[PDB]
Amino acid sequence: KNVQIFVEKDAVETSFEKWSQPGHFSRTLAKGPKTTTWIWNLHADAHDFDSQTNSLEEVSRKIFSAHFGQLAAIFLWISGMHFHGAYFSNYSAWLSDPIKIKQSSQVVWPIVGQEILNADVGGNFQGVQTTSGWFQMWRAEGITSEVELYWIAIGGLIMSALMLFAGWFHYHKAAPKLEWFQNAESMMNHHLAGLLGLGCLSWSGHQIHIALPINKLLDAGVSPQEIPLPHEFLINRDLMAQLYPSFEKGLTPFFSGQWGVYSDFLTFKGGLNPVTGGLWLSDIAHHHLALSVLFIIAGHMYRTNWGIGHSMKEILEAHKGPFTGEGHKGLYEILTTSWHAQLAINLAMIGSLSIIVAHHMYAMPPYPYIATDYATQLSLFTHHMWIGGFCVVGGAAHGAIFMVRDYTPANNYNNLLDRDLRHRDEIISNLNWVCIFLGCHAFGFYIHNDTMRALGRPQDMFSDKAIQLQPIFAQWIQNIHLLAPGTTAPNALATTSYAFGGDIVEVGGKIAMMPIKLGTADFMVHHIHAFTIHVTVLILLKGVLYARSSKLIPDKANLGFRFPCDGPGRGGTCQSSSWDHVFLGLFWMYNAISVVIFHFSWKMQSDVWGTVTADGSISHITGGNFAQSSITINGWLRDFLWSQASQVIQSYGSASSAYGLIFLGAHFIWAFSLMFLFSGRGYWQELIESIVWAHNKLNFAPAIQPRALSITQGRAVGLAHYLLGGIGTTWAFFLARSLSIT
Amino acid sequence: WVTFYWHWKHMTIWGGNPGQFDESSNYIMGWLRDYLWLNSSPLINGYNPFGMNNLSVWAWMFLFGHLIWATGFMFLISWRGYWQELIETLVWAHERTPLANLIRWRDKPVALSIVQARLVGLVHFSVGYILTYAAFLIASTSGKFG
Amino acid sequence: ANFIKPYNDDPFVGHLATPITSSAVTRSLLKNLPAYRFGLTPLLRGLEIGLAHGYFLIGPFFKLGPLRNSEIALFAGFLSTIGLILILTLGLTIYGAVVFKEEKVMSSANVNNLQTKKAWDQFKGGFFVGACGSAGFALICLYV
Amino acid sequence: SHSVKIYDTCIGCTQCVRACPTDVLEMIPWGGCKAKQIASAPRTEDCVGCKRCESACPTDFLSVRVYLWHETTRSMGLAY
Amino acid sequence: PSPIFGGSTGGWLRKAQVEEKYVITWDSPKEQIFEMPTGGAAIMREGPNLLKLARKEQCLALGTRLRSKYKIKYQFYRVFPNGEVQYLHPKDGVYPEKVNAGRQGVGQNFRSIGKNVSPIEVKFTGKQPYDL
Amino acid sequence: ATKFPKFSQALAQDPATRRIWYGIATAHDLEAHDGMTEENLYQKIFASHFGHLAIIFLWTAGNLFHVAWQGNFEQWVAKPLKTKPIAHSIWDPHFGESALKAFSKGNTYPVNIAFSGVYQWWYTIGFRTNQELYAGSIGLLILSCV
Numbered sequence A: 001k002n003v004q005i006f007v008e009k010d011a012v013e014t015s016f017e018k019w020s021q022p023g024h025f026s027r028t029l030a031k032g033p034k035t036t037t038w039i040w041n042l043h044a045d046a047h048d049f050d051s052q053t054n055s056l057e058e059v060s061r062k063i064f065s066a067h068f069g070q071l072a073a074i075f076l077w078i079s080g081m082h083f084h085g086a087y088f089s090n091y092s093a094w095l096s097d098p099i100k101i102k103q104s105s106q107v108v109w110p111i112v113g114q115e116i117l118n119a120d121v122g123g124n125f126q127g128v129q130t131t132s133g134w135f136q137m138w139r140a141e142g143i144t145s146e147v148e149l150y151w152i153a154i155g156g157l158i159m160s161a162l163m164l165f166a167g168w169f170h171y172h173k174a175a176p177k178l179e180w181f182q183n184a185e186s187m188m189n190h191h192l193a194g195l196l197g198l199g200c201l202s203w204s205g206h207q208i209h210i211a212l213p214i215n216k217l218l219d220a221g222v223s224p225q226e227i228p229l230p231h232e233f234l235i236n237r238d239l240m241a242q243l244y245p246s247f248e249k250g251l252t253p254f255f256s257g258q259w260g261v262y263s264d265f266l267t268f269k270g271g272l273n274p275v276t277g278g279l280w281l282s283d284i285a286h287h288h289l290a291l292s293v294l295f296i297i298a299g300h301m302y303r304t305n306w307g308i309g310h311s312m313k314e315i316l317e318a319h320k321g322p323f324t325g326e327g328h329k330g331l332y333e334i335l336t337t338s339w340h341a342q343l344a345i346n347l348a349m350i351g352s353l354s355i356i357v358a359h360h361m362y363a364m365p366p367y368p369y370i371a372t373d374y375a376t377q378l379s380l381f382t383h384h385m386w387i388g389g390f391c392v393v394g395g396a397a398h399g400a401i402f403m404v405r406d407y408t409p410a411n412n413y414n415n416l417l418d419r420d421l422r423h424r425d426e427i428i429s430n431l432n433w434v435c436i437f438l439g440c441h442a443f444g445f446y447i448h449n450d451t452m453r454a455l456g457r458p459q460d461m462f463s464d465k466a467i468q469l470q471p472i473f474a475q476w477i478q479n480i481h482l483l484a485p486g487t488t489a490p491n492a493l494a495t496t497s498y499a500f501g502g503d504i505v506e507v508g509g510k511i512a513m514m515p516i517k518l519g520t521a522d523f524m525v526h527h528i529h530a531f532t533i534h535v536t537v538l539i540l541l542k543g544v545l546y547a548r549s550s551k552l553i554p555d556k557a558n559l560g561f562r563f564p565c566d567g568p569g570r571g572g573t574c575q576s577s578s579w580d581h582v583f584l585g586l587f588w589m590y591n592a593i594s595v596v597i598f599h600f601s602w603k604m605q606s607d608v609w610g611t612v613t614a615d616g617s618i619s620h621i622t623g624g625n626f627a628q629s630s631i632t633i634n635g636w637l638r639d640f641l642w643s644q645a646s647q648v649i650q651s652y653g654s655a656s657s658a659y660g661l662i663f664l665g666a667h668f669i670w671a672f673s674l675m676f677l678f679s680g681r682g683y684w685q686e687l688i689e690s691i692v693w694a695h696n697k698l699n700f701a702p703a704i705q706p707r708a709l710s711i712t713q714g715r716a717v718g719l720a721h722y723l724l725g726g727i728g729t730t731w732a733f734f735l736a737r738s739l740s741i742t
Numbered sequence B: 001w002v003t004f005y006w007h008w009k010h011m012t013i014w015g016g017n018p019g020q021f022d023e024s025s026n027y028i029m030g031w032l033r034d035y036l037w038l039n040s041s042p043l044i045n046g047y048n049p050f051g052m053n054n055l056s057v058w059a060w061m062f063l064f065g066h067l068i069w070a071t072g073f074m075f076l077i078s079w080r081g082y083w084q085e086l087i088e089t090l091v092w093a094h095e096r097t098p099l100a101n102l103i104r105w106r107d108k109p110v111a112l113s114i115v116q117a118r119l120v121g122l123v124h125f126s127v128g129y130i131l132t133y134a135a136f137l138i139a140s141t142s143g144k145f146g
Numbered sequence C: 001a002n003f004i005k006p007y008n009d010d011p012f013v014g015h016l017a018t019p020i021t022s023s024a025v026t027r028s029l030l031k032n033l034p035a036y037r038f039g040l041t042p043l044l045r046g047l048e049i050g051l052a053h054g055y056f057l058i059g060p061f062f063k064l065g066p067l068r069n070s071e072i073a074l075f076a077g078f079l080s081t082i083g084l085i086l087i088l089t090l091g092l093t094i095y096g097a098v099v100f101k102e103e104k105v106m107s108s109a110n111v112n113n114l115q116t117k118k119a120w121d122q123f124k125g126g127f128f129v130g131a132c133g134s135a136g137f138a139l140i141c142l143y144v
Numbered sequence D: 001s002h003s004v005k006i007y008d009t010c011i012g013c014t015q016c017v018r019a020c021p022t023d024v025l026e027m028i029p030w031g032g033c034k035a036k037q038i039a040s041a042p043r044t045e046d047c048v049g050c051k052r053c054e055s056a057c058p059t060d061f062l063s064v065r066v067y068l069w070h071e072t073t074r075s076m077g078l079a080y
Numbered sequence E: 001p002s003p004i005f006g007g008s009t010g011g012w013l014r015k016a017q018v019e020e021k022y023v024i025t026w027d028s029p030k031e032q033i034f035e036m037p038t039g040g041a042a043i044m045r046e047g048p049n050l051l052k053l054a055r056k057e058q059c060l061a062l063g064t065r066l067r068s069k070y071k072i073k074y075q076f077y078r079v080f081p082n083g084e085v086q087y088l089h090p091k092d093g094v095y096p097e098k099v100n101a102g103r104q105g106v107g108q109n110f111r112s113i114g115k116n117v118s119p120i121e122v123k124f125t126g127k128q129p130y131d132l
Numbered sequence F: 001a002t003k004f005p006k007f008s009q010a011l012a013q014d015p016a017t018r019r020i021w022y023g024i025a026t027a028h029d030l031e032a033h034d035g036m037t038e039e040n041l042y043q044k045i046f047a048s049h050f051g052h053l054a055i056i057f058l059w060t061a062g063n064l065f066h067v068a069w070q071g072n073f074e075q076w077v078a079k080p081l082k083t084k085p086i087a088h089s090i091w092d093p094h095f096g097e098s099a100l101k102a103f104s105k106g107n108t109y110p111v112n113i114a115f116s117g118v119y120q121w122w123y124t125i126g127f128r129t130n131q132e133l134y135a136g137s138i139g140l141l142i143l144s145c146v
């Protein structure tokens, strides 16, 4: 057998000795501090496990146990939330009337006049309005009572302590060997079939037996109280056959292969629930079933201990064309002997996933009563755009850490990796052009519109009334999705989303979904999206390809991943390291995602969101100003930023006045960053010397000598304040704007 | 800080309500809302979809300033050896493309130096800074005349 | 099989011989363009080039012009093609006035060479004739 | 070209010469310190100016010193 | 005797045939793969090896990787467009890190650094404080 | 030096584009030029002071000329409380029809309103006609020639 369990017993003694010696993990820091730079190095190097030991087995043991610690903090986080929903919320009052009661799971103490933050939300309750969608998620599970939330909170605490115990057990008591970690084919079979497959099967089981029948009674108008205990849905088929009259057959049409009997709970109707404005739970139960069969079957594609199956190595090595040379040879050693190469894939995938997740939750809203909560819709969408943005660049950082540290030329003669490095001047110069081509056109469309309008010539602007730029490719695709129910998807009753066209869904007088028409003002913005992604890719790609050498520095790989420069000769060598490429690309991701959430917040408010009256008279939030006000920069500056600021700037004395303070606080922090980004270290260290003198004059000085922040560190400070202040100012602007319109 | 203060104090004396500045000038939000947000109305309405006015040039100059100030950030945050490596791929590309090979520079293209980037980034931050305030202070006063 | 080798069997030279660089299509095509054709006076080299450029520079001026919707939409733009050619020619005069050096010895056995001061002047004047003439040719072809 | 000067506080521990990435400095015989050797700058025209030599010099203040000078194609560090 | 390499776009430019180009020679006892300063990988040939590069640093960077990573030792040359060659590394066959009788003093100030003159003293002259 | 910077032999032998950038930015740093003596230094500065003085009087002579030629000084002197003073006229082929009507509100042609305060200044020092303003501009053109 090749797949076995290898574990070392009693590997590391558990004592408080090392806790009292900061910097024990590295060879240079263990001597103790001499300057204040030591304190900074202590934190920057604490998780760099690769630079602490040379053994791959010891690095892998540290990573494994740290995953248990990360999960234990997530369980504690989840257990808190459920606890707040059970003791500091208005969940019951919300369940009885989820159109008038606003949501809240946080209560502040009254101590310095801050009680004003407890808003008058409803249901004889005062608290801070929360926009995480905990409530809607609980209704979809069929919660209905605070008691049930309490058990989740106790079970979250127990799981959290189980994780803490497992991470301690696997690092000190039962430390598993290197052979165990290097089992990719086994690991893939378990994550596909076990984690994802049995996860979707059991979840589907909860949805069919507990979540489906409770939701049917809530939707029909039954008060929570009259709904029976969830376990009573598991015992009496009489209760289950009244709602879905195919339980009288039981489980026999499943083993006879007559699955169309269950069309009561395995639907493919599409659209949304006219009552709640969320997806049909019956579609979601079918969704998890079809997934779980796919995941369990996919977890049999690899060979472990029995002959049958694929070896990952013979797959990749078979793929070689006459342009690619050796093709995929060597990518195994890479992806089974280096943790950096793994994160580079994984973070790029998980970050892309969170972006994908945010696009699908506003167009096909999966929870009930969430589509008309515009504060939740807006908050959840931007959040995943940010988390997606950070993880994507984080994949590119580890790709460049891999090229510097784990990459070897002898392991890769003439393969795809070796070949990319060989024409790296061609990838970068061609990308460079595509960037100069996309920016001059997409941003120059706005300038033209800014000058034409200012010169009194609107007849010559790129608009829906002048020179049109109609997005005909995306309009063509919308028609296909609209005509799809019946033809291309003959068993589908309605379209996947109403964005491609169809009818208007409304819950409580508010609009949940509407067709989203695309015109030339849409078209122009989509290129800005195109353009800012291509530039971000230009910086990160360049950092990975030139991580080891350049024409400028031939021995860049000997200097390391993150070095400040190679001196003021050879012209300027500042920011040549691949860490500095990651540093620059963080500012672009920021630039790119900011335009995305600006585009989403304004298009939804202009052309979807709003209320209605008799004869379907739709009144939008900003009244349809999107086709003729977003084609110029002045229109974006005056109608989006200036007009919609009125809430956050007039929030004083109200319950949303914390958003006005955090608004100013983040404008302050953002400006504070510019002191670190524009200046440099040797002006600050001379400044410290005059200060130290005033201390020496008075007979005292710290024995840990004060030293200015280093070149690399002064950049990482200025970037962290730039993001914090920038994202924060928008955070405060988005919530005080959307709480006032929801 | 001196020019905002001198202007805001006069706009309220001319407007006939000196008390507006006497109460809102104690906290920052007062400055941000009653001076900057409240007085930019006639400037940014210089031109719009409906039409344009005499003050369109100040509105165009207002945006102009914001752009030059923001391009000043490029020269101040991103340093030289990023740019030097980029130009080396551009020198390569130009030398390998047929029909563009007949033309050639007489001065080797290189990235601006360390001290040159600071001076340029400084001139952008400066010219953008002054032009956007000139744009604001002139049209907010002439657009309200009091 | 390998479709990528070092250009001219020189592995250390910084070039790659790919089907975009050196294939039978791109070899015969580039060898017959007027900037690389064997048997052309530098006037003729500039004439042809100019004949093919002035003809399509017309288009974006006549269609997306400031006076495109007037009865003098064709005139407006033709004039502005001539003004574009005057700027391009001006870039050709100054480039050759500085890149090439005057010859001491009347010795001239290659009067055909393009990369010289005397021939560049002929090449520059041929560009101006062919581009103003092709600007006028589709002035006739569009007046229909 | 750049200018590289070497002062008498040089203790001759060869660390600047081992750090130079373009072979500008060398060690020569000298009778003024324990190691009887001093650094020398015979090829300052290959000097790119990266100052790696000064980051390696243990004396306080430095024994080796680089001063900015007129730039050629070699000190600009160009490969074109 | 050029090593085994499939080529790359990071090699020499016009500067080679117009301005000085550099070659490096080394001797290897066996066939081993090394990293190119302008390219990712290449197999060196037993016996003498000859490589052409565009910069002195690129040549010297390869030497450093050939020294403490493979235990081998090399010669640098400057080649002009007319055909004149120059011999550069090692200058006198002996490495610069090791003292060799016969070398001389170039560019040495016979005093410590705090002993330089004020810039006002050398006013209106064509020098500098560190050239006195 | 025999290159573009003729005052820096060390900047004129640079093969990169940096040479162009530096010859511009060190042109006035007279003490650092090749072969500069002290007596020649003071002479160059002195003559540079004359040329600077002439640019100021040429600048003033401009402002007198544009108001005398295109302002409303005479109409302003008659009613200084109602009329808006006129900087100079606009001629820009890039203006739409509504631009020409927006910048000519209250006048006959396109025009910029002055915010320099030269009107109030000239009024209190004696000026009353356009002929006097024009005469003052000729006297400052002659002074600049001297």
Ligand code: CLA
Pocket: A668, A671, A672, A673, A674, A675, A676, A678, A679, A687
């Ligand atoms: C809003 C942005 C911003 C801010 C806040 C500062 C802040 C500062 N800069 Mg500046 N700087 C900026 C932008 C900014 N910079 C920019 C864009 C540049 C161009 C690169 C510079 C360039 C620069 C240089 C060259 C110099 C400064 C200096 C200073 C200091 C001035 C002394 C002072 O004000 O003490 C007050 C301290 C603060 C305002 C920092 C905030 C502290 C907060 C947390 C206090 C909270 C209030 C209250 C005390 C709360 C009590 C605390 C609690 C524990 C009880 C201070 C740290 C000088 C310096 O360091 O001298 C001492 C200096 O020489 N900066």
Ligand code: CLA
Pocket: A063, A064, A067, A068, A071, A180, A181, A183, A186, A187, A190, A191, A194, A195
């Ligand atoms: C069916 C088997 C199975 C399952 C479910 C998992 C599940 C997991 N593995 Mg894993 N693994 C397996 C087999 C399995 N592995 C094998 C055989 C190997 C050796 C090749 C590995 C080697 C391995 C490594 C090296 C790492 C993981 C990690 C992880 C976690 C990924 C993070 C995540 O998605 O959190 C989702 C979290 C949850 C779903 C919470 C579940 C918490 C526990 C573990 C419950 C599962 C136990 C049991 C099946 C539940 C029974 C339910 C009951 C009602 C019947 C996840 C908990 C990573 C990690 O985080 O480690 C801590 C990691 O670094 N695995």
Ligand code: CLA
Pocket: A043, A044, A045, A046, A047, A048, A049, A347, A390, A391, A392, A393, A394, A395, A397, A401, A562, A579, A582, A720
């Ligand atoms: C699963 C995700 C993941 C993992 C495991 C790692 C792991 C690692 N990264 Mg990495 N990275 C990630 C995501 C990840 N990263 C992402 C998303 C990015 C892009 C932003 C990066 C960018 C990145 C760079 C650029 C570098 C690393 C480095 C490292 C290594 C050492 C980290 C260390 O010691 O930090 C210790 C941790 C800290 C010092 C914590 C400070 C975190 C910030 C400053 C505070 C956050 C603010 C807070 C959230 C809000 C504040 C509010 C305020 C009011 C208080 C380690 C291998 C470094 C390295 O040397 O690689 C080997 C390195 O140079 N990573």
Ligand code: CLA
Pocket: A432, A433, A435, A436, A437, A438, A439, A440, A441, A443, A444, A447, A535, A538, A539, A584, A587, A588, B067, B070, B071, B072, B073, B074, B075, B077, B078, B082
């Ligand atoms: C508003 C500020 C601003 C602007 C305009 C730019 C502009 C640019 N940056 Mg950026 N940058 C900025 C801030 C800014 N940056 C900041 C704050 C940082 C610090 C983090 C950086 C860091 C940085 C890096 C690290 C990179 C860039 C890149 C680029 C270039 C993108 C290519 C392109 O489309 O150019 C086209 C020009 C524009 C989009 C702007 C003007 C558009 C005009 C109006 C249209 C065409 C005009 C025409 C050509 C000339 C006619 C006018 C004239 C006759 C008067 C471009 C020059 C990237 C690059 O060079 O890749 C190619 C790159 O890698 N920048």
Ligand code: CLA
Pocket: A440, A441, A443, A444, A445, A447, A448, A451, A460, C057, C060, C061, C064, C065, C066, C067, F094
């Ligand atoms: C780059 C963005 C951009 C674009 C696309 C336009 C587009 C336009 N502007 Mg402009 N403009 C811009 C930015 C831009 N503007 C900026 C930034 C400003 C502010 C300074 C202005 C200010 C401005 C004014 C004041 C005016 C215009 C006008 C115009 C129009 C005509 C211009 C003209 O004839 O040019 C000539 C065009 C060309 C010579 C075209 C060359 C490009 C060709 C097609 C490229 C072909 C590439 C080819 C595919 C390569 C493959 C070859 C292979 C197949 C062999 C046109 C709609 C005028 C108008 O009336 O508007 C209607 C006008 O009066 N613009």
Ligand code: CLA
Pocket: C061, C065, C066, C067, C075, C076, C077, C079, C080, C082, C083, C084, C086, C087, C090, F093, F094
């Ligand atoms: C401050 C000086 C100045 C002046 C006087 C002009 C004048 C003009 N511009 Mg221009 N422009 C300038 C600066 C200037 N520009 C700058 C700095 C920019 C870049 C930001 C532009 C960008 C710009 C654009 C994008 C466009 C103009 C256009 C125009 C024309 C106005 C529209 C019209 O009705 O013409 C209509 C034009 C005609 C009826 C025919 C005119 C043909 C000309 C006069 C032929 C000239 C021939 C001659 C050989 C030119 C030699 C040039 C050189 C040797 C000096 C007009 C000729 C528009 C244009 O060219 O229209 C086609 C236009 O699309 N301008």
Ligand SMILES: CC1=C(/C=C/C(C)=C/C=C/C(C)=C/C=C/C=C(C)/C=C/C=C(C)/C=C/C2=C(C)CCCC2(C)C)C(C)(C)CCC1
Pocket: A078, A152, A155, A156, A159, A198, A201, A202
């Ligand atoms: C929310 C939450 C929670 C909770 C959770 C839970 C409550 C869970 C559950 C879960 C579950 C409760 C699961 C279940 C599972 C089950 C399963 C998964 C089953 C399966 C089975 C099967 C698969 C079968 C098979 C078969 C057949 C069909 C036939 C033949 C025979 C056999 C046996 C083979 C916690 C506390 C953690 C924390 C916090 C959060």
Ligand SMILES: CC1=C(/C=C/C(C)=C/C=C/C(C)=C/C=C/C=C(C)/C=C/C=C(C)/C=C/C2=C(C)CCCC2(C)C)C(C)(C)CCC1
Pocket: C051, C052, C053, C055, C056, C129, C130, C132, C133, C134, C136, C137
């Ligand atoms: C798109 C495309 C393409 C391309 C194409 C092209 C690019 C074309 C061009 C074409 C052109 C661009 C053409 C031109 C033409 C021209 C002409 C046709 C001319 C004519 C002229 C004439 C005939 C003459 C004139 C004159 C003179 C010179 C003198 C005076 C008199 C006259 C006026 C007569 C391809 C194939 C790749 C593919 C597909 C797509």
Ligand SMILES: CC1=C(C/C=C(\C)CCC[C@H](C)CCC[C@H](C)CCCC(C)C)C(=O)c2ccccc2C1=O
Pocket: A675, A676, A677, A679, A680, A681, A684, A707, A708, A709, A710, A711, A713, A714, A715
């Ligand atoms: C200001 C600045 C410094 C000076 C900053 C230093 C020396 C760090 C000071 C951090 C202190 C010691 C940590 C404790 C923070 C404060 C004592 C408390 C402030 C927090 C409030 C909320 C109370 C640099 O060292 C530097 C280096 C490189 C580029 C730019 C810069 C730069 O801009």
Ligand code: SF4
Pocket: A569, D004, D019, D020, D021, D022, D023, D024, D025, D046, D047, D048, D049, D050, D051, D052, D053, D054, D066
């Ligand atoms: S400046 Fe750099 S290249 Fe010159 S001698 Fe010192 S270390 Fe060597």
Ligand code: SF4
Pocket: D009, D010, D011, D012, D013, D014, D015, D016, D017, D038, D039, D056, D057, D058, D059, D063, D064
């Ligand atoms: S200058 Fe510094 S590194 Fe060089 S020999 Fe002297 S002490 Fe050693």
